[PDB]
Design a protein around this ligand. Structure first.
Ligand SMILES: O=C(O)[C@H]1O[C@@H](O[C@H]2[C@H](O)[C@H](O)[C@H](O[C@H]3[C@H](O)[C@H](O)[C@H](O)O[C@@H]3C(=O)O)O[C@@H]2C(=O)O)[C@@H](O)[C@@H](O)[C@@H]1O
Length: 308
């Protein structure tokens, strides 16, 4: 009934594909190279997202058991615990953050179906990945942009799922720095340097901050207020921006590519409706993002976990 997972590959060889300082102009060949190189890794994320999605949607323990089986198999095969091969950037390192986000959110969603044996295999694997990811951001030489907020999510979810309180404080630190990076105009200095993709990267930075906030809401915290409701400013700046890019066009000097707000809106519309600014974007749903935890619509309506 539970199909065979792919072999957990120890090595990642992804490929950065922007050709300009702003990281805004794509080389299509390079975009294709990286896509084919990562396509197996992305198939796995989507599968555990969907199977964990199937469990949250209809309560079937087989969907949760098949998810635990697949995560069980990847831990055992030491998946992505090897070399992050550098082709032309740290693209392989980023994938290990994104994959951790996908595999740890999937685990959290089915964790109440887990028995001690499956816990024994998965936790040390997630924790190895989560500590490996944190240890990249120990170097001060590396700009803590949206990549740091995306790393933060997996580390936080691994902290919550494995109940590793060091990892949770690390995750929270990532979320703190994101909120702290929000200027009074709702903008992020590091994301403002992405020319025509500036608005995309604002939406892209915000989504993992919103997911971390929603993870804190599972532990009975409320991070949303931090720094005098700073997240609402960035939220406003992105949702106003998907409607009207004039501010981003003026502030960066680049004509923005059109953006449709990502699945962070499914939760955020419930936390602070702001008149209902997210209603058009919500109507574009459901939102599927394995890197953010899968079906954001289902999780916003019915919760990330079926029981605390
Ligand atoms: O075709 C898609 O839309 C593709 O998007 C994928 O996620 C992107 C993500 O949107 C984001 O742009 C990210 O950007 C990185 C970039 O890869 C590079 O490393 C740069 O130096 O840093 C950027 C950054 O985050 O600051 O790249 C993601 C990626 O995988 O390249 C996926 O959502 C994919 O499933 C989708 O089809």
């Amino acid at each position: 009934a539970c199909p065979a997972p792919p072999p957990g590959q120890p090595d990642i060889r992804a490929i950065g594909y922007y050709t300009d300082k702003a990281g805004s102009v794509i080389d299509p060949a390079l975009q294709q190279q990286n896509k084919d190189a990562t396509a197996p890794l992305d198939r796995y994320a989507a599968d555990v997202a969907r199977m964990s999605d199937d469990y949250l949607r209809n309560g079937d323990p087989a969907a949760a058991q098949c998810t635990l089986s697949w995560l069980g198999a990847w831990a055992d095969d030491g998946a992505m615990l090897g070399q992050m091969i550098r082709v032309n950037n740290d693209q392989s390192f980023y994938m290990r953050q994104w994959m951790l986000d996908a595999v740890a959110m999937a685990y959290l969603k089915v964790h109440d179906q887990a028995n001690p044996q499956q816990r024994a295999r998965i936790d040390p694997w997630l924790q190895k990945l989560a500590r490996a990811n944190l240890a990249y951001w120990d170097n001060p030489k590396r700009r803590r942009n949206n990549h740091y907020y995306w790393g933060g999510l997996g580390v936080l979810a691994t902290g919550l799922a494995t109940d590793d309180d060091a990892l949770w404080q690390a995750g929270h630190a990532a979320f703190q720095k994101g909120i702290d990076d929000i200027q009074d105009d709702g903008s992020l200095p590091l994301e403002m340097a992405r020319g025509q993709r500036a608005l995309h990267y604002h939406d892209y930075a915000l989504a993992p901050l919103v997911m971390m906030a929603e993870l804190a809401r599972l532990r009975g915290q409320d991070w949303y207020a931090s720094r005098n409701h700073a997240i609402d400013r960035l939220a406003r700046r992105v949702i106003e921006g998907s409607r009207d890019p004039a501010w981003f066009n003026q502030h960066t000097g680049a004509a923005q590519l059109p953006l449709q707000a990502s699945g962070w809106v499914e939760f955020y519309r419930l936390r602070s409706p702001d008149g209902g600014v997210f209603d058009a974007a919500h109507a574009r749903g459901p939102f599927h993002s394995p890197r953010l935890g899968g079906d954001l619509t289902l999780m916003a309506t019915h919760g990330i976990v079926r029981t605390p």
